[PDB]
Paper text:
Human excitatory amino acid transporters (EAATs) concentrate the neurotransmitter glutamate and aspartate in cells. By coupling the uptake of one substrate molecule to movements of five ions—symport of three sodium (Na+) ions and a proton and countertransport of one potassium (K+) ion—EAATs ensure that the cytoplasmic glutamate concentration is ~10 mM, which is required for neuronal functions, while the extracellular concentrations are as low as a few nM permitting rounds of synaptic signaling. EAATs are homotrimers composed of promoters that work independently. TMs 1, 2, 4, and 5 of each protomer comprise the scaffold domain mediating trimerization; TMs 3, 6, 7, and 8 and helical hairpins (HPs) 1 and 2 form the substrate-binding transport domain.
iOFS-K+ and iOFS-Apo imaged in the KCl and alkali-free NMDG buffers, respectively, have similar structures and feature well-resolved HP2s closed over the substrate-binding sites, although the hairpin conformations differ. What are the structural correlates distinguishing translocation-competent and translocation-incompetent states? iOFS-Apo is structurally similar to iOFS-K+ (RMSD of 0.52 Å for the transport domains); both feature apo configurations of the NMD and YE/DDR motifs. However, in translocation-incompetent iOFS-Apo and iOFS-Na+, HP2 residues coordinating K+ and Na2 and residues 414–417 at the start of the HP2b helix unwind and form an enlarged loop with an opening in the middle (states highlighted in pink), resembling an unzipped purse. The potassium binding to iOFS-Apo and glutamate to iOFS-Na+ zip HP2s, increasing their helicity and decreasing dynamics, as evidenced by the better-defined HP2 EM density of iOFS-K+ compared to iOFS-Apo. In contrast, deprotonated E374 of apo EAAT3 is engaged with R447 and cannot stabilize the helix, necessitating K+ binding to zip the hairpin. Comparing iOFS-Na+ to iOFS-Apo structures, we observed that sodium binding led to M367 in the NMD motif shifting into the binding pocket and R447 in the YE/DDR motif shifting out. Thus, in contrast to iOFS-Na+, iOFS-Apo cannot bind and translocate glutamate, preventing the dissipation of the glutamate gradient. In iOFS-Apo and iOFS-Na+, E374 is solvent-accessible through the unzipped HP2 and likely deprotonated with pKa-s of 6.5 and 7.1, respectively.
Residue numbers in the entry:
A (entry chain B), B (entry chain C), C (entry chain A): 17 to 119, 137 to 168, 200 to 474
The structure:
Amino acid sequence: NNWVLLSTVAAVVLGITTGVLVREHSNLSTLEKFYFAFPGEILMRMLKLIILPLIISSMITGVAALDSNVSGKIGLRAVVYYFATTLIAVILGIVLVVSIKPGSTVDAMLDLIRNMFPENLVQAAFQQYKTKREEYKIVGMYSDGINVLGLIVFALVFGLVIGKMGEKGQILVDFFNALSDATMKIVQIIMWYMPLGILFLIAGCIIEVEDWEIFRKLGLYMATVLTGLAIHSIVILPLIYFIVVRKNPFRFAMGMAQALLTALMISSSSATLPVTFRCAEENNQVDKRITRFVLPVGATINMDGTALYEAVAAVFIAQLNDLDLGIGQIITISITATSASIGAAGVPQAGLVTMVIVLSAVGLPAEDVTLIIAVDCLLDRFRTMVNVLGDAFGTGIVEKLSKKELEQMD
Amino acid sequence: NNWVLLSTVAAVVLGITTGVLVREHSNLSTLEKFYFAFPGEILMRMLKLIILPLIISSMITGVAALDSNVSGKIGLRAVVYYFATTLIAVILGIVLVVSIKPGSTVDAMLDLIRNMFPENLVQAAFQQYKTKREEYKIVGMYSDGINVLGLIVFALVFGLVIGKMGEKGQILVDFFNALSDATMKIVQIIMWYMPLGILFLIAGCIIEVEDWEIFRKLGLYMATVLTGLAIHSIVILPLIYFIVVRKNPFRFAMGMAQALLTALMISSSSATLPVTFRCAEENNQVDKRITRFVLPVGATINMDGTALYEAVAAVFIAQLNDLDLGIGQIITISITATSASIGAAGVPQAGLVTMVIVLSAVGLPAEDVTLIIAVDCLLDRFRTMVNVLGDAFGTGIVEKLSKKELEQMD
Amino acid sequence: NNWVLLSTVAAVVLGITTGVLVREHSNLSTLEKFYFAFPGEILMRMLKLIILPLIISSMITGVAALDSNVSGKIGLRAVVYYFATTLIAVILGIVLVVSIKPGSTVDAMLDLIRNMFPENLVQAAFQQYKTKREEYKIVGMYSDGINVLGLIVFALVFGLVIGKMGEKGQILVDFFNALSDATMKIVQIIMWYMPLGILFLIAGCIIEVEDWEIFRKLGLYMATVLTGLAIHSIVILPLIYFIVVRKNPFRFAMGMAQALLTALMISSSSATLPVTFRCAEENNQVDKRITRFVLPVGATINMDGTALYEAVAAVFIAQLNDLDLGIGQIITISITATSASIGAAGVPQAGLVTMVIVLSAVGLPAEDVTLIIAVDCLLDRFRTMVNVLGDAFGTGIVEKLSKKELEQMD
């Protein structure tokens, strides 16, 4: 049976009830509040532990599985699809935030390019590079935080090289195939424990809210973000799927419902990858090669949810201050916020350090994060859900458009 | 011939003579004293270098060698045996320190649980996590020091997964078998050079003592620690072995004498692992699978020596201050000190950072370490000797109790 | 065709022209000067990224390819040749700097020995150990910077062990062979992009010079360094080659011209390794085993260029100050400067941190580096060229002297 998903839904409702009841009838200190959310912290720690080998081995295996003379077209189609979806999401978010009205960059882009080619493979696993101008000379240094962008680029190049090697790279191909399978099984073992961590995480999230008037004050900001995400998930993506693939998009969404729920629950596209693989390969008759190549790329560089969430939050923050913007300032903020997070799109994010960096770069005060940090728990899950839905639709579209390429391999 | 052990014994006696003669007839500055112990520092550095791959590959290989439907009972028996021995050692140490009379915790336990599941596999190889309460909110950060506990847990889970994989994980199994053999050979190469390092280490240890009245002042503390270790090694462990295995325990100890001497000399259970393997498999007719699985686990979570040494030292320090304790305070100190070192029990320890953390947590002053740091050289070697003796007895007991399981594999 | 080398030469001349024209006709701020050299920084970053796996896998593969009973003599001959060449270079540099007249150590040597045996394999990939005396007690700590010396020693020991293992180490041998080939191919991919980075690097180097009288002031220092390098490359090395191998040394140099140009262009002996392999194995009929073993060792511990460059620069700096030296002080400075860089001789060096450490140790002021940092761009390339020429001549000499050993393998 599907005991994991039912248990997780029961844990979610029980955690909501527990948080509400404890907040209403019990008074706890800050230390007790921190101690009440320990299982959720343990679950988040376990989820973080498995991100590196899973994504690295999946990328290498997916790239190496394709023929040398074929992978270029598939990759080109994937990047074109993701760029188009990100542009549409950016436009929709800008239009919605302008209409509803709810309420340094060069260094950031150069750092983004710098992180694509790290100076140390081992150091990139837990550290990132950043520069700042001081009196003017540029000074750079390394700070904690996994450099997923550089590891993904190196993994892609390495997978291409060992796929083109042939008989001399077969041992590496087999090694990374076995590593990918082992990481998948370990992820399943962690999924076994997930529900209790989710229960306590929801209870702690609800308990941490103290004012209870922040939700009332944050009117039309939740409405704006939710409306943008709903429009993107329900209208634009199914229309693109039907236009390219002459098939019903909602049967496709019905097949992926299990992965959609899982992603909505753990809020981690990279973690959900095994369920997405299974749903896309079994429930829908999508080729294994296309799925295994496209899905990690989507979990890495999908920016529709970021464009519909962080960009809107930034424009709302700028609107809170009497800092009336122009068309250029709004477009610059949306571009900076969307581009600054291109590296880490699958890892779980709670502190929104990328958006803090964006706020610092665009000159806005960095102390306004607290006014929206309370509702991040609710919004991030829907962001991840729409991200994985877009990834699945992209796998379907690329499989549709790669008929000749998949014919040559046979 | 056995030229390594005879050479090491000759080096030990020559180092004792050299240290005594240099202290008596020569006067050296602090810088010259530091320069006199350089070869011992080099030997310790080389021993530290080989701890990670050896323990990781040994754990993976030992776990993967067992059948999937069998390893649960073997692991359960091993943990039960180690828990029982640790409890007996704790009780004996408490009783002895109370009778002879020679002279924050929640955060520590939560950190112990946190380190079982690190957030980064690469970072866990050289860094550890720690939290502290400040004005109250909890703040955590990473500090230098290998996280053996997390690596051991991940290695166990990975070994189980790849053992259950079968034909798809055979390549990883072969890879880690070869890695384990290579690490063993490198350890043997280091053992070739060991004796000169031991000579200079003993000479430097003896030279560093300056007062020469600290030994007289530290009366009944050496007596207490040595009596506890001797009682545990000579009475309790052989009695348990004879009760479970109806055989003479001293022939077993006679067979393991080579590994016992080696462990007494280098004071590193993990380093002694190859000699322990050879003695337990050849001198005693113990099954290879049981040995290869139990011995790394013992080298990792054996706490009898820690309970008989650090706990007693802590109670002695608390007795030095006019800080008359109760039964609860003594039991809390013994439990905290024993549990805080569960991660690093095989690596060489000289600075006793774990006991410093324990003293900080139990509210005792941290400046009293110097009064006992002088005799650590002598006591740590006997602690390691009794630890490896307990590990060997545990291998024998588990092999005795696993007759049906070892019958199914055949 | 040879489009890469011709494109790189055209890029070099175009970068020289661009730098001269921009300096003469345009005025730029410091920030614009930094932004003008971004592609060169990206190229240097990519070159740095590939140094670790390439050198590690090449060392392991080269050591493991040789028979167990043979590799000792080959290694002995290689070390003897490198020691003799370094001694001759030291003598020549000292004599030239004394005649032309253009213008703490114990801790350094002990740190050099300490870095040969690191305490952590993972930490050695990006960190180094250093000690300092303070009031006297010695305090050590770790700082950023790859520890190539320790990794090379561990790789050599590991390669010997797995070569002696045989059928049980064949899987590791195959794994590292495949890894070496993959790293070579990735290096070739980077070489594809190299020329534009070289163009912008030369343009930025030329632009950064502002006084334009520093070249006139630095008279007889360029002359001394260039004369020493030219004498070493043209006279001493061909004479040694002809004395040992009764063959024309200039046909050998003509065969290696492609690798010589490449090394002169990128100034990185380790990066040039694939071209050196191809030229030495195809253009000259040198045995593959001798080449694959000797060349990484030369790229790691070749000190002729360092002895002819850093030692002379240090003596020139000491001559600038009215600090008249003796024979012992000059020999101590040359020995310290040559020995302090034994670890990193193949990686690209621009900041000359090793020479800064040498200046700090020998008591000379550390602020005089700026007076010679301007001409480092020009001199380092010739230093690397003579280093790779010496490495190739060493491969030839060792192949000549290893006739019996290469006969036994057949």
